[PDB]
Design a protein around this ligand. Structure first.
Ligand SMILES: [Cl-]
Ligand SMILES: [Cl-]
Lengths: 192, 192
């Protein structure tokens, strides 16, 4: 999945569309069932098209910079800047990823704001927290989560961000994705 | 997937576990992008194990009837009865399904209550609305939704309930599931 610099992406022809998305996350000192460390909580959402993705959407560059556009397309009813920028990937779409660490209290505030948003029940069908832990059965939690259906680029963006923000070791991300994919294969083999 | 009567399920040995779940839904006169009829909204949720399911959980029959247990395990921070019962299926677990039509306003109230619940961010990671429409590309909406990962029995329960409550024609449910499964197959073929 080709990476491109923000400033080079901005020079692409008018035939290129730009999407901007935000990964909002918080340290989570919670312990599921009092024994499984949650470590972090990340917000994703169910989109109108039945896929999981990050808050955000397409930015009309006739009106807005990437950052000004981002803040207007989050749909969370709620100021991200270049300081929050992570990377851009070619998917004729360039997908721009931003990330911001909040307190867990602030992350909950976003969830509350979201349910009261104007976009709730239209383009956004509900927020979900990503489980980053893996249960003893080696599938419950993050591997199962990664076996859901994601909008183009979002799954790759999630895994990229977890790595580069030092939220999970690369080895554990590789394992979780392998477990997810094996699960999908086995499930499809039962059906076919 | 074997069906069993409620009263026969109640006679099963102590080696059988019982789960009770609720499908809360409302008529939705909304039109996505002003052209796609939404028809109904149904609530599901992201569980702690990274799978989509209905609100509910295991009922300890040493303490509660199926109905008394159901109302205590919803996790929505909020009275379902035998009148709301739909069916029971053998999955060593019997999965009991209940359903209740609310106003859209009441359905939104449940979403608000849920984000403020004691279980939010523990066993429940967020509610989502099911998109029952299909976009012009024949995958956006319900087929994509059905391509997510579901906890045992939930996907079958959803499709069963949509049929028997006359919310979607059987032909359209069959089509949506076929589209979902073909999508999963094609996606897995790209990876392998
Ligand atoms: Cl576990
Ligand atoms: Cl469409």
């Amino acid at each position: 999945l080709k990476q491109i610099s923000r400033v080079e992406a901005m020079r692409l022809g008018p035939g290129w569309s730009h999407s901007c998305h935000a990964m909002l996350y918080a340290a989570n000192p919670g312990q599921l069932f009092g024994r499984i460390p949650m470590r972090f909580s990340v917000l994703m959402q169910m989109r109108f098209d039945g896929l999981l993705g990050f808050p955000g959407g397409f930015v009309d560059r006739r009106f807005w910079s990437l950052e000004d556009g981002l803040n207007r397309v989050l749909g969370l009813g709620l100021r991200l800047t270049e300081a929050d920028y992570l990377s851009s990937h070619l998917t004729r779409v360039v997908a721009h990823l931003y990330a911001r660490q909040l307190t867990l209290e602030q992350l909950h505030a976003v969830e509350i704001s979201a349910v009261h948003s104007r976009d709730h029940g239209l383009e956004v069908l509900g927020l979900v927290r990503v489980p980053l832990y893996t249960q003893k059965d080696r599938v419950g939690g993050f591997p199962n989560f990664l076996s859901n259906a994601f909008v183009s680029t979002a799954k790759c963006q999630l895994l990229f961000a977890l790595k580069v923000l030092n939220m999970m070791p690369e080895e554990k991300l590789v394992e979780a994705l392998a477990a997810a994919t094996e699960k999908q294969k086995k499930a499809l083999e039962k059906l076919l």
